[model samples]
Target: PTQFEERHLKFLQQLGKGNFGSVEMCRYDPLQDNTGEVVAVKKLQHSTEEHLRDFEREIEILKSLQHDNIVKYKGVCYSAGRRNLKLIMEYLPYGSLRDYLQKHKERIDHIKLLQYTSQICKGMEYLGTKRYIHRNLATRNILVENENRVKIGDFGLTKVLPQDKEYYKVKEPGESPIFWYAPESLTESKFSVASDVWSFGVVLYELFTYIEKSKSPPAEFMRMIGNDKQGQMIVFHLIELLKNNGRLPRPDGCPDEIYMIMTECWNNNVNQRPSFRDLALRVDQIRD
Candidate 1:
């Protein structure tokens, strides 16, 4: 409330839709200057008081945390009778990393791909320094801006962390979260930096393969880590491979260095996985 006021916003066309909310492109004109700047406005549909509380909590957090690689928060507005809330965020013209890559699949060079991955790692590194756990980290949540620059968004599931806590016990495991999570994150009630690193590994898998679906890994040796009996068996089997022989099977056309990083990110032992800072540095070296 200190710097944000409702009158400055003028809503524009919808950019994306989700179950609980929709994000739209907007024009913000600060009262002092009356100058327009494009921004993304996230209108959160609501049915309960919890939704309002969650929205406020999200605002509080975003207003506190700011970084170049992290999505920027501009302001928020709401209607009393409608019981709806909206968040004003910086606009990224190219949209999500996944969507951008999908449209430009043929045009994107390998160097560009590596650059995107490095930026994601750097973003995660910043979050790490802030002691925040991005419970969900994937290409779909990353926004692409001008010059192929990327910023991490979608903080709805992000959690503030305590110094001693390394794992967040999952109250329940669902379809998609399980698909990207580490073994310890799913099986136990524990989630930590290692868990995020594990998800990053899955992200890399998706990026390198450009496969339509990860529920089924492309190769025979690569196993899908998910929540179920079949998936359980695959997990143990992959662990055995990691300790006894090697790592997950390489994705189609995956470079040796990139594949190695993927494996390192997915190491069964959380202690063995590299930090985001280290991962960013490693990716930067090869991206050049």
Candidate 2:
């Protein structure tokens, strides 16, 4: 079949692994270039039905979209009878947002982080414009591109909800990645674009090495966003306060507007969360 051109992909060294699957740095060395550009190959596990669903979901979301700040879907590689689902993607030479931030600590190239965040907003805004809602977001999903750029990938649990569905307005039950979920997300309601805004707030928190407050603690956030609707934790209230105040102390060495925008997005009232399109415009602009 002509699905693959010139047999472009070559299996390479493994990069990382988790319960769901492992990722490898793939080398696309066509016969023309013995040594060619490397790409990332995500090998999602095939041990269970749930995991397979995630793999298919990611492929479906990525294959249908094209954007500069979003990962480039090269193609899928797997014989019809193969078990594991392989996803070929644009290689991010710089690694994940977690690794990048850990290396630079709070001393990251400030302008670059802002630029990266802006690009992320642009991608999310674009996705939202296309009616795709990223139900799960975190540092890990923010891939670092070769030119110091960031691409928002990892759409395992993302949903292409109906357009009438405004973000933040959860009308039904959907699994929240517990660790990174927004407040209202705790309730079993329909997910709206505002919920994505809430997740974006958390990403900004990690980028800025947040010191103030969000929906959860750092370690707690590492776990999947929980189903905690008790409203006992202060994160719920703190984020609410920040949203009410419409501002808060940004992580050290971060731009003031970033946190301002985050808190504004984290408002308890789903109605108050800004749309991804609005957020893109907000972050792209230097707010006073």
Candidate 3:
């Protein structure tokens, strides 16, 4: 990996912002070389010890990951005595899958959505082998390289499992996308590859229902479970709903087989949920 200095980059514009930090698009023009390229640089907003640790962990995880369907890590830039750390990654023109789906909703077909899902599964399968759990797997965390290519991104919430442990348990409560969480995750604060599969099921739902304003997981769940509930209580109600075999309804134009896969992913028994390896194969068969 190349050591990027602040002088090597020319900040272009802000790409996105979130609680963790903001991503900026930059032009890489190292003084030592004539090669130039566009890159996205992720910088932390807060420099507290805990935030720094998380940022460093994310960089370590990104360094070890290498897959065609996973975002490529370019290098890291340190400025101001390392207080200002920036992560460099390849720039993708099409942006996130969520925004892309919404922007081109009319033009994207079922097959294209399935292809994106399959690519995501492939990337996730690789992560599973690497013993990394992407706790925040969703369309919003996936990047579009082109109409036919997508790569999984966002490692802020990712965790690398210990060799002997099958899952990681949250010690304290914090903000999380509970709507995308598995039953055990919402109730027990536990995360594993199976939980990620559950989130992937929600992403599949997103892909199919992006055109409908009221069909998102949160909206549909709220409508079915009632909007009166709030916070942790809502999660309990959702688990109860799932306990009664409730699941998201099949989207318009969604094939029965695909819906079956979604339900399998949402299986109440965590062990019963299909692994990403199996999902990749199943999605490929459906695509064929």
Alpha-carbon lDDT, every model: 0.74, 0.68, 0.88
Q: What's the lDDT for residue 267 in model 1?
A: 79
Candidate 3 residue pairs in clash (backbone atoms < 3 Å): none
Show the lowest summed lDDT stretch of 10 residues, model 3: 27-36
lDDT of 3 by residue, 109-198 (tens): 778888998999999988988899999988889999999899999998898898888999875547778789888897788899999999
What's the lDDT for residue 205 in model 3? 88
Looking at model 1, the pairs that clash are: 167-190, 167-191, 168-189, 168-190, 168-191, 169-189
Residue 278's C-alpha lDDT in candidate 2? 77
Candidate 3: regions farther than 4 A off = 32-35
Model 1 lDDT per residue over 148-224, tens place = 68888888777778666766665643444555767676556577888899888877877776644543342434534
Encode model 2's per-residue lDDT on 182-231: one tens digit a residue: 65566444566777888888787777763233423444442222335444
Ranking of predictions according to TM-score = 3, 1, 2
Q: What clash count goes with each model? A: 6, 15, 0
Model 2, residue 69: what's the lDDT? 88
Each model's TM-score, in the order given?
A: 0.83, 0.77, 0.95
The better candidate by TM-score, 1 or 3, is: 3
Task: Report the CA-based lDDT of candidate 1 relative to the real structure.
Answer: 0.74
Which candidate comes out best when scored by lDDT?
3
